[PDB]
Amino acid sequence: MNINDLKLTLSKAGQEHLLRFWNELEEAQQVELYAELQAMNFEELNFFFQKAIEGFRMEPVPREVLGSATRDQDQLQAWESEGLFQISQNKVAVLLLAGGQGTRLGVAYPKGMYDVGLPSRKTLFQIQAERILKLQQVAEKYYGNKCIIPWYIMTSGRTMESTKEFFTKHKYFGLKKENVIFFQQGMLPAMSFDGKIILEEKNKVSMAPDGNGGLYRALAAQNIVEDMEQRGIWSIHVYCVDNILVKVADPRFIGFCIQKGADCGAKVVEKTNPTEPVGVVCRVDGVYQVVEYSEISLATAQKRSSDGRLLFNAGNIANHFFTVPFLRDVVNVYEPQLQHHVAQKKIPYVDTQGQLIKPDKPNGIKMEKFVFDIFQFAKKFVVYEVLREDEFSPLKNADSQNGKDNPTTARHALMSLHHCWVLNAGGHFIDENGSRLPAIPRLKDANDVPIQCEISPLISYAGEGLESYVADKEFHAPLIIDENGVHELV
Amino acid sequence: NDLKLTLSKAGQEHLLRFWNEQVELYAELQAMNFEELNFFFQKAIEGFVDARMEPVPREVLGSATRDQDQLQAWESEGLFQISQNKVAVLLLAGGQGTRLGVAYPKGMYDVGLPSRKTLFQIQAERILKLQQVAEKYYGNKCIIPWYIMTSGRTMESTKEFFTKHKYFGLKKENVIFFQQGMLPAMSFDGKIILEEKNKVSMAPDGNGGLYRALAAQNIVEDMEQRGIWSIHVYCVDNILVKVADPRFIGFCIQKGADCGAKVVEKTNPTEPVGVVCRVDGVYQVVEYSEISLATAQKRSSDGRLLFNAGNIANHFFTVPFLRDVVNVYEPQLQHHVAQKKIPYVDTQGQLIKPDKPNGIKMEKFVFDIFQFAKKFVVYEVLREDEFSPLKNADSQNGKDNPTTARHALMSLHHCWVLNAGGHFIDENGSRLPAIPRLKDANDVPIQCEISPLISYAGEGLESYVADKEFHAPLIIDENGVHEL
Ligand SMILES: CC(=O)N[C@H]1[C@@H](OP(=O)(O)OP(=O)(O)OC[C@H]2O[C@@H](n3ccc(=O)[nH]c3=O)[C@H](O)[C@@H]2O)O[C@H](CO)[C@H](O)[C@@H]1O
Numbered sequence: 001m002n003i004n005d006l007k008l009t010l011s012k013a014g015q016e017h018l019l020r021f022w023n024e025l026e027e028a029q030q031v032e033l034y035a036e037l038q039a040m041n042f043e044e045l046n047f048f049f050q051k052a053i054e055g056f057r058m059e060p061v062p063r064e065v066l067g068s069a070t071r072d073q074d075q076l077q078a079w080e081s082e083g084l085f086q087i088s089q090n091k092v093a094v095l096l097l098a099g100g101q102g103t104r105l106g107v108a109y110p111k112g113m114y115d116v117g118l119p120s121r122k123t124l125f126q127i128q129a130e131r132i133l134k135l136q137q138v139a140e141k142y143y144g145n146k147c148i149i150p151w152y153i154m155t156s157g158r159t160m161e162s163t164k165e166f167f168t169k170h171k172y173f174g175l176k177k178e179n180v181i182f183f184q185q186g187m188l189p190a191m192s193f194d195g196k197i198i199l200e201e202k203n204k205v206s207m208a209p210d211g212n213g214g215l216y217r218a219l220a221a222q223n224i225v226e227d228m229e230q231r232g233i234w235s236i237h238v239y240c241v242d243n244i245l246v247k248v249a250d251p252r253f254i255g256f257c258i259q260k261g262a263d264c265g266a267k268v269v270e271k272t273n274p275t276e277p278v279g280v281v282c283r284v285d286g287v288y289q290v291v292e293y294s295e296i297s298l299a300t301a302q303k304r305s306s307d308g309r310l311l312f313n314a315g316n317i318a319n320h321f322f323t324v325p326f327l328r329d330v331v332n333v334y335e336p337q338l339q340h341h342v343a344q345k346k347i348p349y350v351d352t353q354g355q356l357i358k359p360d361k362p363n364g365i366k367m368e369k370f371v372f373d374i375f376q377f378a379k380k381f382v383v384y385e386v387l388r389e390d391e392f393s394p395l396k397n398a399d400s401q402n403g404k405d406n407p408t409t410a411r412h413a414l415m416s417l418h419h420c421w422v423l424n425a426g427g428h429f430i431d432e433n434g435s436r437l438p439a440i441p442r443l444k445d446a447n448d449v450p451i452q453c454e455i456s457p458l459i460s461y462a463g464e465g466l467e468s469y470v471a472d473k474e475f476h477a478p479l480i481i482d483e484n485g486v487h488e489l490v
Numbered sequence: 491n492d493l494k495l496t497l498s499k500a501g502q503e504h505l506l507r508f509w510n511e512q513v514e515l516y517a518e519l520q521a522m523n524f525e526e527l528n529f530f531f532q533k534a535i536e537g538f539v540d541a542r543m544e545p546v547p548r549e550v551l552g553s554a555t556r557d558q559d560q561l562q563a564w565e566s567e568g569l570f571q572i573s574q575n576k577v578a579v580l581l582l583a584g585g586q587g588t589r590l591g592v593a594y595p596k597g598m599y600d601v602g603l604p605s606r607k608t609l610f611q612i613q614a615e616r617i618l619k620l621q622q623v624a625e626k627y628y629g630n631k632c633i634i635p636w637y638i639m640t641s642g643r644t645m646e647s648t649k650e651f652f653t654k655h656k657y658f659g660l661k662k663e664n665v666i667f668f669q670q671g672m673l674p675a676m677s678f679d680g681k682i683i684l685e686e687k688n689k690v691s692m693a694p695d696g697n698g699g700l701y702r703a704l705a706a707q708n709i710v711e712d713m714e715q716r717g718i719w720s721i722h723v724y725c726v727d728n729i730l731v732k733v734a735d736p737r738f739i740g741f742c743i744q745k746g747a748d749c750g751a752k753v754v755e756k757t758n759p760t761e762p763v764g765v766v767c768r769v770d771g772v773y774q775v776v777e778y779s780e781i782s783l784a785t786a787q788k789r790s791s792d793g794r795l796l797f798n799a800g801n802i803a804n805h806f807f808t809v810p811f812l813r814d815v816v817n818v819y820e821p822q823l824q825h826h827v828a829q830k831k832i833p834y835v836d837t838q839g840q841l842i843k844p845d846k847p848n849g850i851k852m853e854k855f856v857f858d859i860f861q862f863a864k865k866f867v868v869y870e871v872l873r874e875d876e877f878s879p880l881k882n883a884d885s886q887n888g889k890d891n892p893t894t895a896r897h898a899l900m901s902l903h904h905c906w907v908l909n910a911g912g913h914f915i916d917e918n919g920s921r922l923p924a925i926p927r928l929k930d931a932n933d934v935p936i937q938c939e940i941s942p943l944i945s946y947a948g949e950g951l952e953s954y955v956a957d958k959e960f961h962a963p964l965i966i967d968e969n970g971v972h973e974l
């Protein structure tokens with residue numbers, strides 16, 4: 001095949017404009033452009049665009065399928081035991097969605113590498129790794145045997161390299177390299193309203209990850225499910241990379257799903273503010289699903305039930321439970337029934353004059369599948385509600401943006417939680433004179449700051465095991481408790 | 491050595507320790523009842539509740555959400571009272587700190603709204619609005635006097651600001667300023683700390699100092715002289731505050747109460763809001779800094795926190811009730827204490843900023859009179875509609891800062907437009923969703939601001955936006971519609 005056959009292929013698909021700058025490119029750019037174009041399926045892309053353009057009631061989930069960490073507190077112990085047991089049997093794996101690019105946070109590296117400013121300065125990646133290590137250890141102490149929790153990590157073309165290097169550089173945070181499986185998701189080109197693929201540069205097609213629902217075709221392309229089956233895994237905990245509080249492989253959530261005989265589960269927190277950007281779990285025509293925040297109407301989002309809570313208050317925190325057999329069915333059957341969700345974006349591009357432009361008005365669409373669109377195909381779906389202060393504080397914005405879900409709110413949510421762990425375990429905080437500080441600080445002066453406390457996951461997964469370190473004792477913050485002991489920072 | 495002997499019979503001699511180095515230091519000194527200050531300190535520190543706390547009972551709790559079927563009746567009653575000139579508001583603006591990083595009172599703060607209006611102007615226009623609305627609903631020019639409590643630390647700036655903006659359209663004679671007392675800082679041993687070799691460290695005596703301030707300038711008499719029956723007390727820092735809110739006032743009136751507290755649902759155990767509750771039969775607010783974590787995290791069977799009535803510092807008091815407080819109950823009010831790092835001037839004329847707390851500050855709280863009311867009620871509203879406080883600078887702890895304040899207002903006005911049948915569209919004219927996907931560096935939420943003169947709480951917008959599409963930033967004011 002040569003530049004002649006390619007031109008024909010592109011022309012028949014209505015994409016010949018992709019070669020318009022070909023004679024102005026350096027030889028090395030032509031080699032690169034050529035290669036990228038040869039690895040694209042233009043017919044499939046056209047088909048996807050057609051369905052997308054052509055694509056231009058709800059009921060709460062019944063109480064019977066919703067478990068609550070708060071209301072069903074009497075069952076936590078049983079669910080936790082089940083979860084730890086599954087973990088000790090090596091039947092549990094976690095799968096991290098870390099393919100998201102385009103940093104709105106103002107940086108060029110992936111979110112997993114972000115340092116939210118914790119006293120320990122650990123990145124989201126390391127905190128996650130330590131929670132996995134913690135559970136491996138906890139499981140080994142209540143069952144005696146060493147166990148493994150494989151860590152599948154989905155990266156995209158824009159996060160793969162940097163992510164792999166980062167892990168290598170950190171010696172996998174203490175985990176074994178063989179138990180961390182990286183796999184890349186696919187990508188899709190931005191397309192203008194007329195159906196033409198958009199060139200970002202004269203020799204480069206504007207591309208982006210195909211949405212977190214692209215997990216399924218990625219699993220197929222790299223035989224991940226075969227890997228899970230070979231390892232003997234039964235349960236998979238899928239989660240979002242940006243939540244500093246995520247209970248990776250949370251035994252309570254896993255145990256709940258197992259005990260209920262579910263093949264699919266979704267962890268949620270109560271949505272109280274009508275406009276919070278979280279999808280809502282619900283059902284339509286007896287089929288379970290999530291309606292993304294950007295696709296719900298204000299009337300629906302603000303609807304209240306007789307008790308005063310929002311009618312649709314099951315806020316998706318992107319923490320799901322999938323069994324391996326269900327994933328196999330999704331990968332080999334349902335995947336094609338997943339539809340692309342379309343967003344109208346301002347895509348930077350190169351114009352006919354060869355100049356890079358930042359559109360004042362949206363000039364194209366981005367197609368993406370959502371990871372929760374497979375809920376509808378589950379044989380047995382359940383919902384598990386937890387408290388957000390214990391489990392959900394997302395990093396989506398830079399500090400200079402809208403004021404929420406940023407590095408500042410993330411580190412403060414973690415430190416406040418750990419601060420609470422110490423008080424609940426019997427400890428206290430004091431000032432410079434040994435005076436006891438209240439549970440909620442009076443922040444009146446410029447220099448006043450909240451209590452800084454941080455507990456390593458290796459020491460405590462969710463607040464347990466601290467009494468011997470803090471009971472009846474007082475500490476000067478910042479306080480850190482890790483594998484090296486108790487440390488009060490100066 | 492007359493006043494010099496005074497300090498002696500109070501162990502406060504050390505104050506003149508720098509006298510031999512003297513005009514204002516005398517004017518400030520001979521205005522302090524040293525006798526009383528020793529009594530306050532001792533009692534405040536004396537002995538250096540959570541178990542006896544009980545939740546707010548359903549009998550006294552009203553909800554704007556759950557009792558939506560009565561908002562019309564309450565709103566009418568409140569508007570009626572306003573038309574009868576029987577309603578006044580009282581702003582607590584004596585507070586002043588270094589927290590926001592400015593040298594002026596919060597009321598003058600500009601959180602960055604499209605209009606750039608300050609909290610004072612927004613509040614003033616809401617007052618103007620209810621007068622305008624009341625005049626049209628009952629045919630008669632009515633008035634809502636605006637009492638503003640300031641401290642010696644905000645008094646001058648405030649008055650100037652108002653005069654500058656010609657009282658934002660309100661009548662000078664209807665805006666009554668009155669100063670609140672002040673209290674001295676003290677060391678743990680009980681000695682009044684001198685800030686400067688010629689200055690005593692002073693600070694306002696808490697928003698609870700309101701009651702003594704009322705007596706000092708005969709504020710209550712004036713209220714009776716105007717025929718006012720209801721007073722709405724509120725905090726200055728909340729950009730969404732519904733000044734003279736007819737619904738809250740109507741609810742209290744209609745319920746025949748002499749004291750009321752507007753609240754929002756506290757969902758996060760460590761949120762810094764006081765919680766309304768009952769202790770040994772009487773209502774109180776247990777301040778966020780005095781509650782234990784065990785109590786704060788306690789949940790009820792429905793999954794909500796047991797003490798979920800978060801005080802948003804918006805109270806209802808009848809003039810008769812206030813009178814009884816200023817002339818009888820005031821003395822029973824206690825002083826809440828807080829350790830502080832007070833800059834001082836030790837021996838050898840050495841001036842320094844403490845690295846460790848070196849004393850305490852005393853304050854009375856405005857809600858500590860709830861316990862004296864005959865009929866106390868609680869009115870629960872939604873925080874997205876009425877509460878988004880300004881307490882911290884953006885560089886601080888990440889909440890209740892200028893950024894969240896302006897976004898909470900713009901999100902609410904954005905919602906008013908949609909609920910009135912309006913629509914927002916992008917540059918191509920495609921309609922935007924109610925909840926935007928903020929994925930790129932330049933993505934921002936829909937910016938929208940509606941002047942109170944146009945809408946007080948989302949009403950009267952149909953003619954302005956029903957079945958219409960706008961390009962945000964969108965501003966709707968007395969000068970019409972503007973797309974920036
Ligand atoms: C589709 C989805 O999950 N929506 C949920 C996600 O929305 P958001 O819009 O907040 O997030 P998002 O879809 O952009 O990304 C969520 C997660 O998916 C990852 N990602 C995204 C695109 C991609 O092509 N590849 C990839 O791996 C990303 O790295 C992150 O871990 O989080 C919110 C909580 O904060 C909610 O629970 C929303 O319902």
Ligand SMILES: CC(=O)N[C@H]1[C@@H](OP(=O)(O)OP(=O)(O)OC[C@H]2O[C@@H](n3ccc(=O)[nH]c3=O)[C@H](O)[C@@H]2O)O[C@H](CO)[C@H](O)[C@@H]1O
Nearest residue numbers: 582583584585694695696697725726763764801802803855
């Ligand atoms: C005592 C009190 O009200 N506590 C409430 C107030 O606490 P905060 O500690 O957040 O506020 P704060 O007592 O410092 O000030 C509250 C209001 O009182 C004013 N002020 C304060 C001190 C003074 O000497 N003079 C004066 O006029 C200040 O200008 C503001 O308008 O707000 C929180 C959030 O909204 C809650 O609702 C707290 O329960």
